[PDB]
Amino acid sequence: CGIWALFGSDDCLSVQCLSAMKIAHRGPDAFRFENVNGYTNCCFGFHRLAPLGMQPIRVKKYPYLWLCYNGEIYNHKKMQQHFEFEYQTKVDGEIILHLYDKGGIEQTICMLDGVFAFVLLDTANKKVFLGRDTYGVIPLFKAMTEDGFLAVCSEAKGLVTLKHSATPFLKVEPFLPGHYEVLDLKPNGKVASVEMVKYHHCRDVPLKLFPGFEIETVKNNLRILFNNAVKKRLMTDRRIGCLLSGGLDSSLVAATLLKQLKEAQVQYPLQTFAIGMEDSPDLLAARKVADHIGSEHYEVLFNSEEGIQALDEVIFSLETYDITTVRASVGMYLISKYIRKNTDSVVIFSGEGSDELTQGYIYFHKAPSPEKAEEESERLLRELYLFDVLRADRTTAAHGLELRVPFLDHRFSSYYLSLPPEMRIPKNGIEKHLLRETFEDSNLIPKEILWRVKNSWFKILQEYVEHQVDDAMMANAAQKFPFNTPKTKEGYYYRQVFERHYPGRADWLSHYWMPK
Amino acid sequence: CGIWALFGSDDCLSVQCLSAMKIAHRGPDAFRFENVNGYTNCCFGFHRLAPLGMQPIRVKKYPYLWLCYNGEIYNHKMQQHFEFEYQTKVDGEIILHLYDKGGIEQTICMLDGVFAFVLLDTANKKVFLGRDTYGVIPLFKAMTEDGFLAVCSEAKGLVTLKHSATPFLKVEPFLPGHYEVLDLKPNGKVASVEMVKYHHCRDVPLHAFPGFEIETVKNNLRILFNNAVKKRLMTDRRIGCLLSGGLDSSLVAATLLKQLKEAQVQYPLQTFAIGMEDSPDLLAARKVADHIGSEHYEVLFNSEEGIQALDEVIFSLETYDITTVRASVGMYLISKYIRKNTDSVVIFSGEGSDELTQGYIYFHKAPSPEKAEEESERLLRELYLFDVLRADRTTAAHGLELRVPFLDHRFSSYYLSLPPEMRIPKNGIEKHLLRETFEDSNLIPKEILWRPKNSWFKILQEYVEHQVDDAMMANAAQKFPFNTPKTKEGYYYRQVFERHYPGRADWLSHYWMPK
């Protein structure tokens, strides 16, 4: 789904509908453009994927509450029962209105375990509220003007097109994950920012066994939390698939997903997807996992020409120029296109965030101290809304598909980060040793995968960019891209394409990778 | 309230949204712009006039029915007769409750009120377009041979539309009294299937003295006029009136005030009269207001504003007819004054009396009463272009509403069913039956009931005399081949209309027939 708001508008709302429709790829099934009574300058916009729920949500009990949200709140039945809240509509996000009425904005955002990005408007109290998930899933982009012009969109493609007269420059920036912004609605449609507070994560009480921090009492808790995350991500009326990259995280996610699906009396078989080159070891591992679990495996053979042609599309969708995310997202875009075309699975489960939480990266072997490794992991999790969640989310949503990341749930990630740093660090030369040990006896995935001319894909990209980028431009790039100057030709070409699609807005990224 | 629906659109939808906002003046409170699931090419748009609804009506009992209408029916509270539960607070949902009951022919023939609706049935794969018998609520359709369809309220919301597959699209006013059925092809585009008239009264059997003697007809006419005013009274907005100083406006104002007093209405009636300084029409309006006690607001509009409002009047009225523009200048000014310095939205006016009651001066020179009846029926059929068109385009242009009490289905059917001798002028005075009907109720002073019948045309001609050169009137036969203006005023109106609406000048076939 795609949310969109235009609180404050000196221009007409018809010239500003093209920007709203620029994110129509998120849901190509419905679209509603609606204004707000008394504040006709401010409007809304929603896109839906897959009967008679739509947005904005205006309920009879709260006539002054206007909510435009996209994502999934998993603990809505566990809270509509704890506090009786009659829901007029079948929308998952209706509980946000009730929680806001009951206890304001601070308590309506800390009890939404799940992924979400919402815009809330209160005419009675004359206030506007924004929100994003604590890890950056379900992104949000905000554009603010000193006059009081406010814009919010799911992606940045819906804000750069927007025209605001009486102000030459409009600043479009990604909404900081884990934050809520309270702004005051002036009686002319404009807004004035009143506060911006980070609510961090939470460890919800209404969600078994959590004795302490012993080795045998940690693996059991990790298993319980992972299974609970998969179970709570299961809830949906749409088909669920999986992306088998061949790694430990994807294999564990697929195995647990299959087990919980079988426990949920689900009729459709699970569809696991793998993308790679011919006879690649990753594809072999994915096929081994699929055969071990018995899932409908769909292998996609990567051809370099398709990636070369789709470089521009993936740069446009991802809205970034970082080399690593583009290289890792070209294949994800292709596999999402294949899933949309040849299969009927929309909900996609991936093991994104495991490497940045379970110390899964190679350079973590060179951490001077476990505390440094923990700090690096926390920093990666904070900056996850720009590198991997962006790659796993924008590319997935570019084809009308939904993303689920069980490794990025609040409870399991919080418990893993609360573990002593001596346990998260690699122990016997293998990264993420604790996660591998926690599933030794469950027999979820084969043992050889549990504990585990060279990669001839980046060579094609390197040679293509080298042929397409001149050395004189690279020398000139110091005075051509003053902010985040590319150091290689690949970065230069990615930046060139990104500026061609988005001119002058390159502040969305400030670093690349690898703090060895 | 304005409605704007697209079917079979191929040139996206965001670039086609700016055409809908051209009718935002009808309702400036809210605005919706929806789509059709499975038919993304099709889209809907509603402009609401003022708490929680919009009119892409989808009722959970009929998930495949999407209705958009801009009007108000007076027979919905048929709900008691049919025991039809209504999910929403709108009075158009019953249309769906009727469409499943008996189709579209029976639904549109039992709607007592003004309406122009578009309905989409996905299950039956059809689109239905409807308009009232006298066309009080406007409706304009633009259809291409490819399958494109654009149904709006006014025409200003369709001339902006773009067809990337056809150079020219024909925007024509939907006929007043027809229902149109179109087959919904899978590609969103719609072909043309059927278009049948439904005419007039068929709802009076299933909802609420024979003879033609002079007393019985008078009693029946009084009863029907009172019933029309009473059924038009129902609304949540304030009710005003336009005191033109004539018989029809005075009668409507008196009956409206009497019913409002019978309705325990707290707010006083607001009667508005626009005219020149010290004019007989304004004096008559003041006399009527004093006799009935309504709060009277008088506007002494000067020639400068009327001249400066000619462009906007022609833009809103979408016509180049001389008389329509002449009356529409004053109607537009009085509507602007009403919106600006008054909280009254619903307006009552006698638009349809001079045609249905044969109250024009030239009706005296009638070759026969049958000829007069035929002329009156011809005027009623073309009423959606001259008088109703102005009374709607100059009212909805300021976020107001028009409630014509004289063009009631039962009242018109009974008046037109009378012998032609009674309708014709009796003693050299037109509308004799209407005047005799209310001669005992003491609604309005006798000096105004009788005595049948302000220099604004002269300044209009003076302004448009040094604006159309004598050379520009010589080539009018080669500059405006269709409906060539015979006067300089008509040439000015036509040039303004062409500047606002280029090429699409076939909406008005004739100009106006005084005989």
Side-chain angles (χ1 to χ4, degrees), chain B residues 193-217 219-221 223-231 233-236 238-259:
Chain B
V193 160
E194 179 193 10
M195 200 167 188
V196 193
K197 256 174 63 74
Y198 74 97
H199 226 313
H200 64 66
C201 271
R202 226 206 56 83
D203 49 74
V204 299
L206 310 100
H207 217 253
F209 271 109
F212 288 142
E213 66 105 359
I214 203 169
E215 289 290 332
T216 292
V217 53
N219 210 13
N220 283 122
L221 286 181
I223 287 179
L224 294 180
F225 185 60
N226 293 22
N227 205 350
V229 166
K230 208 159 330 188
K231 70 207 286 194
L233 235 78
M234 149 206 97
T235 182
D236 300 71
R238 210 207 180 114
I239 281 143
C241 190
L242 262 48
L243 272 189
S244 301
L247 173 81
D248 44 356
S249 269
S250 306
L251 278 183
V252 169
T255 300
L256 186 77
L257 193 38
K258 186 171 62 67
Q259 305 301 334

Side-chain angles (χ1 to χ4, degrees), chain A residues 12-15 17-19 21 28-35 37-38 40 48 51-52 54 58-63, chain B residues 12-15 17-18 21 28-35 37-38 40 48 51-52 54 58-63 89:
Chain A
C12 189
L13 292 163
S14 60
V15 298
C17 184
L18 295 93
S19 59
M21 277 271 287
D29 213 327
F31 140 72
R32 176 184 296 183
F33 198 119
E34 203 171 10
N35 290 10
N37 321 339
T40 59
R48 185 192 81 221
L52 215 178
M54 274 299 275
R58 300 222 205 232
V59 280
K60 277 92 191 47
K61 199 161 59 180
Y62 314 120
Chain B
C12 301
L13 291 163
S14 63
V15 53
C17 183
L18 317 101
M21 298 291 294
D29 190 72
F31 148 72
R32 196 171 269 181
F33 195 94
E34 258 196 85
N35 261 15
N37 38 315
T40 314
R48 194 191 66 183
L52 217 172
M54 303 304 298
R58 314 224 188 219
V59 152
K60 59 226 305 283
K61 200 198 296 181
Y62 313 111
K89 307 304 171 300

Side-chain angles (χ1 to χ4, degrees), chain B residues 63-65 67-69 71-81 83 85 87-92 94-120:
Chain B
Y64 305 102
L65 276 69
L67 162 130
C68 44
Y69 92 113
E72 143 181 348
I73 77 172
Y74 316 130
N75 234 21
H76 68 135
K77 290 265 207 327
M78 279 177 328
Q79 167 185 322
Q80 291 164 356
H81 178 16
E83 288 136 30
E85 52 177 5
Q87 175 207 312
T88 57
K89 307 304 171 300
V90 310
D91 44 328
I94 190 169
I95 294 179
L96 313 171
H97 297 298
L98 285 171
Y99 172 79
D100 269 37
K101 187 80 63 179
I104 184 68
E105 171 80 279
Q106 316 298 351
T107 296
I108 220 174
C109 78
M110 289 173 331
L111 291 185
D112 198 329
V114 304
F115 59 91
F117 65 89
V118 7
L119 206 160
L120 173 53

Side-chain angles (χ1 to χ4, degrees), chain A residues 111-141 143-149 151-156 158-180 182-185 187-189 191-218 220-232 234-317 319-325:
Chain A
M111 309 187 237
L112 288 187
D113 274 7
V115 317
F116 59 94
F118 64 86
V119 200
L120 181 55
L121 171 63
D122 205 22
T123 298
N125 274 339
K126 318 263 294 181
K127 262 155 175 45
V128 183
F129 305 90
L130 318 177
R132 199 176 169 181
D133 194 14
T134 187
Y135 281 118
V137 195
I138 300 313
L140 201 152
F141 279 71
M144 190 91 186
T145 297
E146 77 262 1
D147 324 317
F149 172 64
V152 152
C153 187
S154 289
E155 300 183 2
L159 304 183
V160 313
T161 279
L162 281 169
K163 39 210 43 173
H164 180 25
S165 315
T167 302
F169 169 74
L170 171 65
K171 193 175 185 300
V172 173
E173 54 181 348
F175 193 88
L176 266 205
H179 292 25
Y180 75 85
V182 186
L183 316 92
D184 277 39
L185 203 65
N188 57 271
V191 317
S193 203
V194 114
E195 98 201 328
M196 171 154 245
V197 190
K198 148 157 45 43
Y199 72 98
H200 225 296
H201 305 66
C202 179
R203 307 76 185 155
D204 262 323
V205 13
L207 224 52
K208 4 273 175 57
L209 181 67
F210 311 95
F213 279 158
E214 204 261 352
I215 176 61
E216 274 285 76
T217 86
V218 160
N220 188 268
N221 303 341
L222 292 190
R223 254 174 303 206
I224 287 181
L225 297 179
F226 198 18
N227 296 8
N228 174 56
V230 173
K231 226 179 320 279
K232 86 206 290 194
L234 264 191
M235 148 203 302
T236 183
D237 296 329
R238 284 182 278 263
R239 190 155 176 170
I240 307 177
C242 185
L243 258 53
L244 270 185
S245 299
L248 175 81
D249 44 357
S250 282
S251 307
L252 282 182
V253 167
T256 306
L257 187 47
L258 198 87
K259 185 172 64 67
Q260 307 288 341
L261 275 173
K262 190 180 65 179
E263 290 179 1
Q265 274 67 36
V266 147
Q267 316 295 330
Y268 63 90
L270 187 68
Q271 285 160 299
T272 54
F273 304 93
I275 193 133
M277 302 300 221
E278 292 84 8
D279 63 86
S280 180
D282 295 328
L283 254 48
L284 259 290
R287 212 177 302 110
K288 219 165 292 273
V289 162
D291 296 0
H292 187 271
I293 68 192
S295 59
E296 232 189 281
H297 198 61
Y298 283 64
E299 229 172 20
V300 185
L301 269 204
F302 197 180
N303 54 110
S304 296
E305 191 70 26
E306 225 152 349
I308 300 313
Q309 296 191 243
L311 271 193
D312 307 29
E313 326 197 89
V314 303
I315 293 172
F316 186 70
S317 49
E319 306 174 346
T320 189
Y321 51 97
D322 183 17
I323 45 181
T324 305
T325 176

